[PDB]
Symmetry: C3
Amino acid sequence: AMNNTIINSLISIKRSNVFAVDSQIPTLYMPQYISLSGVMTNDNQAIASFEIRDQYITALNHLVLSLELPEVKGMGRFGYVPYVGYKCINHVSISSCNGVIWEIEGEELYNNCINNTIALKHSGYSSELNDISIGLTPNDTIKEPSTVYVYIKTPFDVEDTFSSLKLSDSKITVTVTFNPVSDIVIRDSSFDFETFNKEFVYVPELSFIGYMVKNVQIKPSFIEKPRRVIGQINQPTATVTEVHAATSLSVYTKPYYGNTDNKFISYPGYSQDEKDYIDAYVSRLLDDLVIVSDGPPTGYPESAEIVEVPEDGIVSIQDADVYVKIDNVPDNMSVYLHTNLLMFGTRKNSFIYNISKKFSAITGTYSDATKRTIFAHISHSINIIDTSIPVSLWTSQRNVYNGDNRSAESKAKDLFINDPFIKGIDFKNKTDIISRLEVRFGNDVLYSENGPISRIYNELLTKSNNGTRTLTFNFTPKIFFRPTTITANVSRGKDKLSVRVVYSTMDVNHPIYYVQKQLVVVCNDLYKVSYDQGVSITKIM
Amino acid sequence: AMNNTIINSLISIKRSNVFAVDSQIPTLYMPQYISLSGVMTNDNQAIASFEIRDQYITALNHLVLSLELPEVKGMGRFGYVPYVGYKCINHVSISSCNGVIWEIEGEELYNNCINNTIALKHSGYSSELNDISIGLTPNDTIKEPSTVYVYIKTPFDVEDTFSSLKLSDSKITVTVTFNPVSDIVIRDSSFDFETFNKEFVYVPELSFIGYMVKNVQIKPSFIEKPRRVIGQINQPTATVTEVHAATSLSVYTKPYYGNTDNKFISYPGYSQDEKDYIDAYVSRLLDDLVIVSDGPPTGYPESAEIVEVPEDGIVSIQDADVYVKIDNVPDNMSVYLHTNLLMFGTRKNSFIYNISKKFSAITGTYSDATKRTIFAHISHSINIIDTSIPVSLWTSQRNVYNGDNRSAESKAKDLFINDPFIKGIDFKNKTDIISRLEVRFGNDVLYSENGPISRIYNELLTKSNNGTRTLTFNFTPKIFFRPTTITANVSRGKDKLSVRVVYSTMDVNHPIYYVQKQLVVVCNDLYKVSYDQGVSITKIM
Amino acid sequence: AMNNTIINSLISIKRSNVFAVDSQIPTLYMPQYISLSGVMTNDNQAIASFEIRDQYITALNHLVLSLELPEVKGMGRFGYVPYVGYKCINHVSISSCNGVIWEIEGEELYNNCINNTIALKHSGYSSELNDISIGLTPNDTIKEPSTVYVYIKTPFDVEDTFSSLKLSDSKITVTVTFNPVSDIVIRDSSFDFETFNKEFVYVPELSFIGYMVKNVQIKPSFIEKPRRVIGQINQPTATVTEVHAATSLSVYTKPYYGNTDNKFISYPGYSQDEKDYIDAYVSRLLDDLVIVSDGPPTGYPESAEIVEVPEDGIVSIQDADVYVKIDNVPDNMSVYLHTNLLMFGTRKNSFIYNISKKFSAITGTYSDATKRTIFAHISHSINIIDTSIPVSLWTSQRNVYNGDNRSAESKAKDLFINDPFIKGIDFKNKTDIISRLEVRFGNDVLYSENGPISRIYNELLTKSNNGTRTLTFNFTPKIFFRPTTITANVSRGKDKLSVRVVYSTMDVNHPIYYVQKQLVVVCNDLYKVSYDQGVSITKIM
């Protein structure tokens, strides 16, 4: 029922038809899902190799790696890192008889896939995998066997068949190097990690979409291979040499925990919000913070200053006042507040970082049935950095105090965490430790910034939530155009990308000041793909 | 402020202009939102017919069906299934004078729209609709009147005006067949469903975007019509005949509850996470699991083994130990543990499935004001399958035990659930009951897999979270190319798609072993659309 | 490993190659992120001006505005509105020597960006910014300094370099007008807003992506400039004159709070779900609703009817029964129910809106340590409208009752909220106050609807969750085609868009009946962009 207004509004010119189109008949082809088994060899890293050789496979894309995780038994606490499938991959390489066609580091693969929620979920992200489970007997099953699937995104996936890797009758080999299983496991000290590690085995299977094409017409294309460079420990510089045609440049920082035992007080498991991290940390602290006891509590170091709560409920810790109210406290028992649970300082009369001063209100109810306090509303100022401080840093040699005044029961619940893709200096990469960034191409300054406007642009343009500081040089559509690059001038000397940052200033009495940092620079170089005598790539100069 | 580096980096060749384009003048047209009322007729299913006849409507797409849900009154418990608007649709057909142009089943329509969160939300997904409400008097209003909107996605929507259905001066009729209202309602036994069902009436209105086009130039196009085949009860096979040009093939399993009363213990209402299902189930179980009583609890079957909790809090149920601690228990009362609340077994001395053994720690506080236990931390191993077991299966004839030892008050809270789009054998389609899948085209094997790598690929390629095992044959862009299909060879005999699965093995002492299953195969056939003497389609061969 | 079925299925015709493409070499260019500082001037609104003048910048797009929010100190309660960065912008204008090239209102900018979660998050959406913080001393830091980033989406962003604004050697000026800081702040009366407002200063920096293009070839393009018209207070009409080529028309309603003090009882801060709003409101009400007291509670107006709860727990308020059970009540104390906490009525014996009657079950436990009630399960019927009623409306002159019988402590916790982008008559724009909508073009009726099917279509087509009633006239692809518009017929008189709504009927005894409403109509006009003697636009007629 069109209105008279509508039928009279339209009341000559060459007009493009937007209500019809001629359907082009495409190249004749037939796709097939193909699964292959690999040969494992053993740095002694595990390495899986897959050989693709079939005259009827003309092209392929969409590599998926499946992994069988085994049943885990015994006692102790044990979970998997989130996205375990991606955290397992150290390196991936695709190569033909002519050499390497494409390759990537596992962290860069994860960074490229981090905006793909479906892929992250298939990589193994669930409560059954990522909760920290407990075994009570040597026969208790901590984790049941399960299979995860890792989508190995390549440049060959962007335009479906248009960008797919053509096999010009050559053999194609895919090689997957794995990280050691310690990287993907979160465990306490009571778990028999030596036995688990001696018995653990990666079991991979490779899948891809193959294309049988009739009368294929191959043309040369353009591919981008990421290349990574890691700076020295705590140095504010890193240089990428032999840069002749780069499409983009990425910069970020990784913490280095090699000077520690890799032990942390808490970990939220499947829950991965900042609030979840903080809630897990606070839950671990409260068991030692407020104590209901018949007499002064026992089982703490001599350095512990445990103080009885007065009738008004306020315990003053220097300038800080902590409000403590516990219901149903027995008559033969008092309420005590640990006033220096964790403390750090560099001089005997300077500023002290004291975790007890971060709490302002603690309320809960005591349970006579379970002999413990069930906490309710907690008012505190604990941030993600406190949850990210390694346990070794509290008891460092630079600390003029004891450091860790927790009970032995609390110290036995600390977890080993060797997650290989941690960015920044906290688990969420929230704190921005870069205050200034300068990028040089040759001797001349290419780009400078103070605030993270390059990260803001990276996130806006890629529609990601976990972006980094990225200089993007290509804004042209993929595949159909040759990508735009910054191009070297060897005569002028402009053929390397030097990066210099200024790190943010931290308090020398904050434990986080001593986490070691490395600067990571990623450069995407442009390559040309040719299909004469097999598959070949050349670096564009 | 361009840097000298930038202005000297660019320091001939035919270059495509990527900073400008000539704006093509499109076909002259004017869109209008048009709403129509239908004629209802009454298998006795309701059927709504809408006639589109207007010489000035040249094309249309984007069908939306609105439905007025009436005010629900009375007593009992009552909610709507999530996405009630889509759950209401049994069948949709679009046809002209020449015959059916396009049609789909309601479940396939839901499957095609499941990745559209906006559409699912408009279909009716809110707490006011999907919470299980309670009426206390015969005049209490359980649900207020509300309107839902169902987006009926067709092939005519993919490329906006390019793919829109052209009305070549013909009459177009849309016919909507509805499911019976029992399918979309979740109620207990105290709700007067007979009266509600006698008085309920579907009230639909149809909307679409029409296009008045001046001097339209129509061309023939290609359309895909899904076709479904349902296998026999508990058979591992299903065949699709007359397959001459298919773009894709989908496979999944549906549970068949016809051998039951369709009653379930719990349902989470608006909350639809797996954890929400499990929490609702546990909340229903705890009211009978742990009892605070003055003397041995009364009101349970003679088969119930209710045991007093010792002072240490551990009750051993065969090999399983349950820890029970309840605060504030009165002095004249004890704490009791129901040790066989639900139990299933096939032999008198074999394995027993016992829901009481799935709990390891139960803590809470008794309330003297409300005479009930408020539970706190619960440690258990309840999975989604337990929440999906029908109540009839516990009391089956094959069970050598009583089965359901709950109280009458608990049994009166069970809910009828007839949701028509359930997949798998649980409400979340999480358990994978297919262990092996083989697809044959003619006599030859087209595809085999063990793990669900085809489902992994379906989800990756369609960016969905609720994918199925799907063989996709078309990777060419829609509309602008003729779609790629697997093509029949009638000379060779290759003209049907046979499907055979191997179902996963289950424990004969698990109640879920006896849920009946059907195999569903969906085949998308390619059709050609022509515009001579009205609108016509032909099957491509 | 291709199957024999696959290799025999494919066993002439001009076929388009879908496995290769010739890579076109694009225009030579180099992008750069450029940041500028502005000149501030002071309706006395702050205004930031940025001058872009550089012969080597050929084109630009992707404007980002950063803002430094200062440290907030003192006592009282203080937070920022969600998306503070967007809420700060009153107006944005881009202009060259020829005049205004493009401009938009801040509310329309927010509406265009509301589907961009990344952009909304960068605008300032976090607990640290949006929680309502408390200062206790005149030196307590309520908020730490932080920087937000506002993505100013323009038409120049849709097709990357294709749609970018060309600077034809002209100077380009960007002007940002800011809202007063009262609009972006949520505070109580104890916060020193006069001092904060005297000292607050907007500190903006502008960024954009510039393009140095070698041998650019510029062509004329088409741009759409939104234009807004606001109807008179409580009038159901609004007209847009001089409409000669419009691509779309939007309609919605804004509440007008100028007849109030802009004070509300509660606000959920960072949590922005409807349930969060309702939970914050209920949490504020419960502290006065149920009172544990030694004797009749004191500190309430003489109009307050506070009633002791009987032993059965049921207090009847006219036809409504409230169930109140509180555990651990001391022996020298009773439980009391405030039965007319908030009440509104227009006649002394007609219907009364009473907030106490909206509660059906209240349970909790009294705390002897903190002298307050910790509530548990609450059964109520509080909706978002109750949470959106302004405090002034309860104590209106039309109310024949007192209105607000809360304690002084509760009244001191009310918050000032001047959020400038509120739609509808509640904070979530959930209630639909438009029952019928008629759009006229000239004298003839262009479109009519009752239900919000135009909003349903707006949301479906734009993939948004916060759509409005929108008539869309353009369904052609952006940039590459000249947009489709409704076109004026000045001879016939069709050159204005008149809008008339019928507002929904409300109860004259509901306080929400008296919130004043304005009708907002937005019309997107089509303009042509030319590049002779700088940058110029002309209105298409």
